[PDB]
Structure 1
């Protein structure tokens, strides 16, 4: 029985990795993720310039998940490019670098400089589309004309295989339209479903107060709240993008949740909220739990069940 995968011309010991933004902002964080049993890691979504992000408190967690409005705090692109080019040990596991420029031009500028490092070291790009653009316009992946622009410009500037991080969708017509845009771009080799469920609001009954400071307490939701939404999006894109990989993200706390993701279509399975809460020890537990479900079922490899979710009649 094994959890090994080979994809994107890399080899992975197992399908687990952090979700972008968790345990990946500093060199310390990246070294920690590298030392963990995860099969890969991804760096914090970066901007050209370093950012301090939003005022605190800007993350809170609870039994059923988390809420955040971090504001893209990050050490800036040059830091993450240096990590990728000079510090990361590729003998340990593969590295994804996430970018989240505030404009299409900022993304182009970063990808242009990432490309020779990607070619030489094999760092993999995850472009974050679940990201602000013009204020008063929907996030990029909810504005399909902007999404197409961003992918055209990045495809031209980068010229190498990459993947994209998507927000959740809730309407079949959106699945249809979004997948059809992605399927215009052959360099888009993987699609990560999903980023947080946008602008939720957690309220504490005792204090009568929101629990995060930015945006009057509105922020993105992660965790147990979002698992069925994550599954739906993994499977919707798995079905509509047959020449691309889907990576699953949302609501993973156990090997069983990972099994469901993989049944839906996931290749890699990313862990955000639960990793934030439990720490990097989670990865040994998830591996063990997933192997136990595979053993009970007679499954020897991930491909035996990936995308094999059954429907009824």
Structure 2
């Protein structure tokens, strides 16, 4: 009894991977994720140039989850491309590379360079649509016209199957509009739901202070706070995008939580906060726990229950 699966013309030992930004920024981090029991890894979202990121403290965690305003600290696209082209051991697991350029032009420039390495090595593109839009505008995925433009331009520039990382939505009309945008693109083969629940605010009662420095304490939420939001987004897109895969991300701390994401429609399951807090050992625990729940239920495959969440009446 094993959790291996095939998706996107690649084979995966199991459905687990890190969430972009967690344990993926440096060569050391990518080596560590490659040595783990995860089924796959994704790199830190990158920009054309290297970035320091925001001032610290910029990440904090708590029993219910985490808040972050990292600000895209990363080693720059040239580094992640070199990792993909020369350093990653593809015999170990598949690699996804996440791109988050600060404009459409920057994303086009990066994807034009990724394509031959994708063809040659099989690295997979996850395009982060929480990439910053023009300042004073909402993030790109919350601006449907910008979202359509980015995908038009990337599709043209890249020319190969890719995926998109989405922020959560909270309104059924918005599910309908977003999914319709995505379904205009046939090259968009997976949709990762969700990025962090945007612009939360954690306050410490003892000190009377916010807990992160950037943005007056405001940052994206992850972890237990966001599991029902994550599940809703996974299912909403699973129902609306029948010709795409959905990748679940948000609130996974256990094999039960992974099971819920798969029931909702997830094909891979990404682990952010919990992985940041527990370290890469979490992947063996998650696999064990997911296999235990499967065995108790009599399920011998992921396909037997993916997307099979039951509704009432």
Report the TM range for the smaller structure's normalisation: over 0.9
Distance 2:145 2:19 in 1: 27
CA shift for structure 1 position 131? 1.9
* Cα deviation 1:144-178 (Å, max 9, x = unaligned): 00000000000000000000000000000000000
1:11 alignment partner, SS class: strand
- TM-score in terms of structure 1 length: 1.00
Query: 1:265 — aligned with what?
Result: 265
- Aligned-residue offset at 1:4: 0.9
Alpha-carbon distance in 2 for matches of 1:2, 1:154: 36
- Distance across 2 between alignment mates of 1:130 and 1:236: 18
Unaligned runs of 5+ in 2: none
After TM superposition, give the deviation of residue 132 of structure 1 in Å.
1.0
Alignment match, 1:125: 125
SS of the residue aligned with 1:259? helix
Q: CA deviation at 1:49?
A: 0.1
C-alpha separation in 2, matches of 1:204 and 1:220: 17
Q: What's the offset of the Cα at 1:130?
A: 1.3
The Cα of 1:121 is off from its aligned counterpart by 0.1
Unaligned runs of 5+ residues in structure 1 are none
Q: Which residue of 2 aligns with 1:256?
A: 256
Please give the alpha-carbon distance, in whole angstroms, between the structure 2 residues aligned to 1:261 and 1:141. Answer: 22
> In the alignment, which residue of structure 1 is the partner of 2:43?
43
Question: Which whole-Å deviations, capped at 9, do the CAs of 1:239-281 have from their partners, x for residues lacking one?
Answer: 0000000000000000000000000000000000000000000
CA shift at 1:2, angstroms? 2.2
Aligned to 2:278: 278
Deviation at 1:301, TM superposition (A): 0.6
Q: CA deviation at 1:116?
A: 0.1
Between the aligned partners of 1:3 and 1:299, the Cα distance in structure 2 is 11
Task: Supply the distance in 1 between the matched residues of 2:246 and 2:4 (Cα, whole angstroms).
Answer: 16
Distance 1:165 1:3 in 2: 24
**Secondary structure of the corresponding residue to residue 134 of structure 1:** coil
User: Equivalents in 1 of 2:200, 2:242: separation in Å?
Assistant: 32
Distance 1:180 1:133 in 2: 20
What do you get for the CA RMSD once the two structures are aligned? 0.3
